[PDB]
Amino acid sequence: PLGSMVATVKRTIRIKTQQHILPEVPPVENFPVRQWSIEIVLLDDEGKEIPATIFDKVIYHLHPTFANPNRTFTDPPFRIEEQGWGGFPLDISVFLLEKAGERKIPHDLNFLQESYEVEHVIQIPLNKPLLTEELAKSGST
Amino acid sequence: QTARK
């Protein structure tokens, strides 16, 4: 990194998606309606999943066809459950502890697998004591 | 499985 970005650490997030058809919901234009879920975990320096306590809030910014498309969750693993008929790209806003910053994590909600996981690297500052202490749980700081 | 919005 350069400049102010030197004072950061990288962490890997894993976005975990699951989906299945709901037969009791009438297909929309012959397309089945599916229940789907997204959860977010943190990986440590060994690759083990641990609670993503470095975020005090996650907002899923859903496709505009959803009612109340901006859904806020405050407790790991920030699980969202919805229903729909089509996949879409979405930004997941994760808010670091101590107002350290919003990160927009690009996700794609799709039906290509019953469940699938995607890892994303984010850069996190080291100037908020409580966040730094929390970061120690998932690796070097 | 390839359905998109």
Side-chain angles (χ1 to χ4, degrees):
Chain A
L2 269 182
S4 71
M5 278 192 186
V6 176
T8 59
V9 67
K10 287 175 161 183
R11 287 287 185 275
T12 297
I13 307 303
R14 180 177 283 156
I15 308 178
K16 301 167 71 172
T17 304
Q18 290 202 236
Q19 59 87 11
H20 63 95
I21 292 178
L22 298 175
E24 70 274 18
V25 180
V28 179
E29 304 188 1
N30 285 330
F31 285 70
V33 169
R34 297 166 186 273
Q35 166 101 12
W36 50 259
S37 73
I38 305 167
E39 299 181 337
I40 295 171
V41 298
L42 177 58
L43 305 188
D44 65 12
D45 41 6
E46 282 194 89
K48 176 203 194 208
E49 297 185 359
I50 64 169
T53 65
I54 53 164
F55 307 134
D56 56 13
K57 185 189 283 193
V58 172
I59 308 175
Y60 297 90
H61 299 297
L62 299 189
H63 195 267
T65 47
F66 286 90
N68 319 283
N70 301 294
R71 314 281 179 86
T72 291
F73 298 88
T74 58
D75 292 297
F78 310 101
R79 178 185 171 93
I80 183 174
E81 296 186 336
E82 257 297 343
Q83 306 177 357
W85 39 266
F88 52 96
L90 67 150
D91 267 348
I92 300 175
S93 278
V94 300
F95 287 85
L96 294 163
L97 299 184
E98 299 290 272
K99 293 187 239 274
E102 177 184 12
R103 301 287 181 270
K104 296 219 215 176
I105 298 170
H107 189 45
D108 193 87
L109 184 285
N110 61 73
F111 312 139
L112 297 166
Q113 305 180 45
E114 180 142 309
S115 58
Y116 61 95
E117 300 81 48
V118 184
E119 297 171 10
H120 296 267
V121 178
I122 60 170
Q123 257 191 9
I124 303 166
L126 293 172
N127 63 345
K128 295 295 159 69
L130 289 193
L131 176 55
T132 306
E133 294 203 354
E134 208 62 24
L135 283 166
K137 301 179 178 178
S138 52
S140 60
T141 51
Chain B
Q1 305 166 126
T2 71
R4 321 272 312 172
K5 299 259 199 186

